[PDB]
Amino acid sequence: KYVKVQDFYDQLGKYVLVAPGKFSGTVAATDLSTGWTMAWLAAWNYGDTCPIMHHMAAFPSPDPYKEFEFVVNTQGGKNLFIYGVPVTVEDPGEGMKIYRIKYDGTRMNLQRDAAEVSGLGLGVHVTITPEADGYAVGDGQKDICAEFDRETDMVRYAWAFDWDPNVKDLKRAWLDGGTMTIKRLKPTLPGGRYDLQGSKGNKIDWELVPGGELAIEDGKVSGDRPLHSVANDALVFDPRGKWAVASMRLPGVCVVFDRENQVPVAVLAGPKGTPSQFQLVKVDDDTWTVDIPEVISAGHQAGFSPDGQSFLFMNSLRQNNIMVWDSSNHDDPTTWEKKAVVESPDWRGAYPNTFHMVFTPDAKKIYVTMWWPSPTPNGIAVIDAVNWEVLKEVDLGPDMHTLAITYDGKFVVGTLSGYQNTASAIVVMETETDEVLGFLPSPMGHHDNVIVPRTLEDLRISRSTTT
Amino acid sequence: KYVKVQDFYDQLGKYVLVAPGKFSGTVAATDLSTGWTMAWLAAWNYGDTCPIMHHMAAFPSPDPYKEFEFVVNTQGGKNLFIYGVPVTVEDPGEGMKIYRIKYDGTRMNLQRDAAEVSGLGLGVHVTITPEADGYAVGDGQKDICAEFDRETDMVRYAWAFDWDPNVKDLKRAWLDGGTMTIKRLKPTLPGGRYDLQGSKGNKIDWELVPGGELAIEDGKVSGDRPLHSVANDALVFDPRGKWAVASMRLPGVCVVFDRENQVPVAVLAGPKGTPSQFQLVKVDDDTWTVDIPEVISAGHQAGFSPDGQSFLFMNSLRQNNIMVWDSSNHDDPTTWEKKAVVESPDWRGAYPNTFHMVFTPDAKKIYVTMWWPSPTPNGIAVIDAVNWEVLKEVDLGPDMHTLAITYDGKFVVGTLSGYQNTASAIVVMETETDEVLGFLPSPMGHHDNVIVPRTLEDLRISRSTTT
Numbered sequence: 001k002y003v004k005v006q007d008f009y010d011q012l013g014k015y016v017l018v019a020p021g022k023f024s025g026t027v028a029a030t031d032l033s034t035g036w037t038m039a040w041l042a043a044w045n046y047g048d049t050c051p052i053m054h055h056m057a058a059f060p061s062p063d064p065y066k067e068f069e070f071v072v073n074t075q076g077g078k079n080l081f082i083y084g085v086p087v088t089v090e091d092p093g094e095g096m097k098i099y100r101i102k103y104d105g106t107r108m109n110l111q112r113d114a115a116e117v118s119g120l121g122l123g124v125h126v127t128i129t130p131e132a133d134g135y136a137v138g139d140g141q142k143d144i145c146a147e148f149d150r151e152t153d154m155v156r157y158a159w160a161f162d163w164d165p166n167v168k169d170l171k172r173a174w175l176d177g178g179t180m181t182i183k184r185l186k187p188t189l190p191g192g193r194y195d196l197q198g199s200k201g202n203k204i205d206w207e208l209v210p211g212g213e214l215a216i217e218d219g220k221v222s223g224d225r226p227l228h229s230v231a232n233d234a235l236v237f238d239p240r241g242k243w244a245v246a247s248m249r250l251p252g253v254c255v256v257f258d259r260e261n262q263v264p265v266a267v268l269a270g271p272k273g274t275p276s277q278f279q280l281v282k283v284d285d286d287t288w289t290v291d292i293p294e295v296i297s298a299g300h301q302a303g304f305s306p307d308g309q310s311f312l313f314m315n316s317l318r319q320n321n322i323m324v325w326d327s328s329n330h331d332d333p334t335t336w337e338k339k340a341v342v343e344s345p346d347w348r349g350a351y352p353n354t355f356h357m358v359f360t361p362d363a364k365k366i367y368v369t370m371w372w373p374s375p376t377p378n379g380i381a382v383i384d385a386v387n388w389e390v391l392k393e394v395d396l397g398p399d400m401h402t403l404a405i406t407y408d409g410k411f412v413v414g415t416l417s418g419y420q421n422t423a424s425a426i427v428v429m430e431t432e433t434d435e436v437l438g439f440l441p442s443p444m445g446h447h448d449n450v451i452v453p454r455t456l457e458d459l460r461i462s463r464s465t466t467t
Numbered sequence: 468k469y470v471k472v473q474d475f476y477d478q479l480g481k482y483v484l485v486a487p488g489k490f491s492g493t494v495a496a497t498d499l500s501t502g503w504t505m506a507w508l509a510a511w512n513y514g515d516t517c518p519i520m521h522h523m524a525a526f527p528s529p530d531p532y533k534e535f536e537f538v539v540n541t542q543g544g545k546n547l548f549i550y551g552v553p554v555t556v557e558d559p560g561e562g563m564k565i566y567r568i569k570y571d572g573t574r575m576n577l578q579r580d581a582a583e584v585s586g587l588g589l590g591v592h593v594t595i596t597p598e599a600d601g602y603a604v605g606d607g608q609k610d611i612c613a614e615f616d617r618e619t620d621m622v623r624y625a626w627a628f629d630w631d632p633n634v635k636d637l638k639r640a641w642l643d644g645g646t647m648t649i650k651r652l653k654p655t656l657p658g659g660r661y662d663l664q665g666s667k668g669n670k671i672d673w674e675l676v677p678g679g680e681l682a683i684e685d686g687k688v689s690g691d692r693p694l695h696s697v698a699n700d701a702l703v704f705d706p707r708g709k710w711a712v713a714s715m716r717l718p719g720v721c722v723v724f725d726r727e728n729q730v731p732v733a734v735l736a737g738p739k740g741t742p743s744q745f746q747l748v749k750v751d752d753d754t755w756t757v758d759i760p761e762v763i764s765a766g767h768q769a770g771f772s773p774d775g776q777s778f779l780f781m782n783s784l785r786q787n788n789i790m791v792w793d794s795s796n797h798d799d800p801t802t803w804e805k806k807a808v809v810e811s812p813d814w815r816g817a818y819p820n821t822f823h824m825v826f827t828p829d830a831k832k833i834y835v836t837m838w839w840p841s842p843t844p845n846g847i848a849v850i851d852a853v854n855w856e857v858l859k860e861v862d863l864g865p866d867m868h869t870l871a872i873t874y875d876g877k878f879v880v881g882t883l884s885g886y887q888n889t890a891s892a893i894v895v896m897e898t899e900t901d902e903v904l905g906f907l908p909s910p911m912g913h914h915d916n917v918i919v920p921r922t923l924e925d926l927r928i929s930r931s932t933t934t
């Protein structure tokens with residue numbers, strides 16, 4: 001006669017959800033087949049003075065219930081003062097830690113801070129390589145992204161980016177175009193180490209939040225070198241191998257990198273009305289430039305379809321759409337050409353903004369997020385990835401963040417995070433008829449979440465190809 | 468075709484669950500009618516450097532969805548080192564904070580630390596007065612409990628307890644009896660403030676855990692004055708008013724206090740093998756003693772039925788049973804007489820221990836917890852409180868903590884907490900047929916939980932009359 005919540009979990013399958021919690025200072029694994037939290041960790045327990053637990057990704061495991069490993073990073077400094085929490089720690093730790101954690105079937109074990117090992121600290125998106133042999137991190141305060149080895153936590157290659165505006169006034173520095181520099185970043189310390197932990201390398205004193213291109217232009221973001229910011233976000237991976245793609249928010253471009261040869265190969269132009277690409281110019285063995293005549297919109301989410309056939313870059317704020325390239329030629333990214341743009345009245349005004357996406361395994365649909373400042377309901381839009389069309393939107397609640405999918409394609413599992421001070425939850429949506437099945441408690445300010453993959457194939461629709 | 472978890476919540480009613488997280492550093496409110504966390508708070512944001520968020524209790528609100536207030540305390544110092552977490556913290560805070568927090572319909576707001584206001588910091592159970600005009604806190608390291616005014620956060624009265632063992636060897640200090648002193652504790656600083664914040668007043672360096680009486684007896688608990696310990700736990704309230712009862716773990720007694728007259732009036736004797744009461748002896752206007760010829764077993768949980776007719780104290784470890792007194796004479800607690808003992812052949816070992824309870828509104832049933840160290844399944848026992856017999860025992864999972872009940876009496880909502888490093892969750896049991904309806908995620912190490920009450924009568928089955 002009474003309803004068992006167990007009936008709800010039974011339908012979901014044997015899948016493990018993991019999410020960090022931003023200001024909660026915690027990270028947590030949840031068994032979607034029973035409702036239990038399997039294990040949680042609090043970084044304060046380890047001496048972390050600013051445990052803003054940020055992005056994460058998990059390596060595949062043959063049985064996540066027996067063990068899995070993941071990478072979760074942190075932010076610090078003035079990132080602590082971004083929200084409507086009246087924080088009282090005026091001088092917090094610097095963050096930019098890159099933690100390696102292993103769930104061992106019972107508990108989470110903090111293995112180390114890869115930022116200490118490598119010397120490179122980075123605080124935005126974390127992704128797993130498609131071979132599950134490494135991971136990558138980006139950062140929009142220091143504009144560096146890097147691919148790291150899973151066994152050693154050392155950098156394989158790191159890239160620094162810089163902006164040289166046509167017009168040396170913050171209001172016009174991006175709109176009126178400029179030249180971006182792509183620079184090979186080499187170790188400066190003994191033992192192959194970098195000297196780029198915590199705040200070292202910061203151009204700006206906090207990460208640009210949604211709409212932050214306007215704040216930086218308006219002189220409202222402090223830092224050493226704001227005129228030269230690009231706000232790198234992520235380093236995402238072609239599921240077919242070989243290529244990694246770095247997203248650059250403020251110049252509205254993605255840079256395609258050859259992973260093994262450690263050179264950029266292509267620059268993709270985000271905004272609608274630009275060509276497919278800009279010309280990459282080699283200056284020397286460590287340095288490349290690209291000239292961008294004007295930037296009519298910043299962009300944000302970048303990622304691939306699970307078959308590598310499509311690459312997507314979201315324009316956000318000044319334009320809101322999804323720019324789509326034909327990346328079917330795996331041999332030569334300079335031939336990748338614009339094939340579609342997803343547009344919709346759902347992209348009402350300056351908001352909502354779409355920062356996250358997940359594909360179905362067969363690549364026919366995608367679930368993308370619709371974020372707004374409080375108090376407009378935030379939610380999910382469903383995209384037809386064959387005809388490049390928005391099918392449906394659903395309203396959920398405050399502060400929508402990331403989306404994952406169970407590896408059978410059946411359920412999208414997302415996080416809402418209360419702007420760090422109000423309502424937060426896990427949402428479950430079924431992909432057959434695109435109905436919201438409801439919410440699970442989650443007292444965490446999640447900016448990321450994954451389902452733990454079992455195979456390399458699973459990684460194609462996990463935190464590897466998209467953010 | 469798809470099960471909506473919303474159907475599960477629709478059945479529970481409009482009730483708000485609140486729980487702190489111990490090593491998580493956090494506290495959270497959950498809407499049982501939708502699955503959302505309503506709001507959460509991380510005490511590191513407020514400069515707490517040892518945010519072991521410990522016990523708590525909520526005041527009644529006419530509408531918890533619009534606003535409610537609660538009290539949550541903290542522990543620190545060497546309590547950080549008691550669990551399986553390999554903590555690395557070099558200068559941990561001392562804890563013993565007593566935070567006042569207000570939920571305002573959107574977020575949690577830290578109001579203040581009442582230990583700073585009053586000068587008295589206490590780290591174990593927190594309970595609300597039956598009038599909702601005050602709260603009380605106890606502490607088993609300092610052996611102090613006090614009742615505080617809700618508006619001013621100042622002490623109404625405080626009591627300090629001390630053990631004088633017959634035999635001055637830790638192994639025998641309790642088993643061979645002694646004399647406990649009950650002493651009025653008066654302030655020493657300007658403005659009527661105590662000088663007892665943080666570790667000030669600790670006789671031992673951490674709270675005794677389950678079976679901790681063996682630890683202290685074996686010389687394994689550091690402190691300046693362990694021979695003097697009684698391990699106060701709680702100050703619970705007769706729902707009929709007038710009386711408050713302080714539980715003493717190590718001597719196996721409870722002391723009944725006249726709240727308004729500020730005097731003790733009776734000492735109830737815990738273990739099977741003792742009379743109903745021990746004799747209270749007045750030494751002077753501020754000081755009483757009680758002689759205990761032998762402590763047969765330590766005790767723990769203490770509380771009243773919602774009609775105040777029964778009073779219960781659990782014997783734990785050396786005996787595991789529920790000792791029950793006839794407290795129907797509200798005029799004179801010296802008349803309170805043992806009327807029953809709940810016993811089971813399943814409780815014959817050292818474990819399980821039963822540290823928590825909640826009654827149904829009509830006082831006919833009790834839900835009690837069954838705690839064991841890893842890896843024995845912990846769970847809930849259902850007690851017939853008319854005939855004083857065990858009805859049912861259910862296995863749930865690791866590290867069972869507290870119990871609450873919806874105020875219509877339909878659902879028991881408890882917390883399991885992972886020993887701070889493994890699986891944790893909220894459990895829901897329906898009380899009609901005592902079936903476990905299942906679990907909700909809860910990435911917290913809860914040692915307390917409540918449902919926000921609406922009325923004074925609701926408190927009778929909240930964190931007021933029992934722990």
Ligand SMILES: [Cu+2]
Nearest residue numbers: 125233355467
């Ligand atoms: Cu991003």
Ligand SMILES: [Cu+2]
Nearest residue numbers: 054055447448
């Ligand atoms: Cu973020």
Ligand SMILES: [Cu+2]
Nearest residue numbers: 700767822934
């Ligand atoms: Cu207790």
Ligand SMILES: [Cu+2]
Nearest residue numbers: 489521522914
């Ligand atoms: Cu506790």
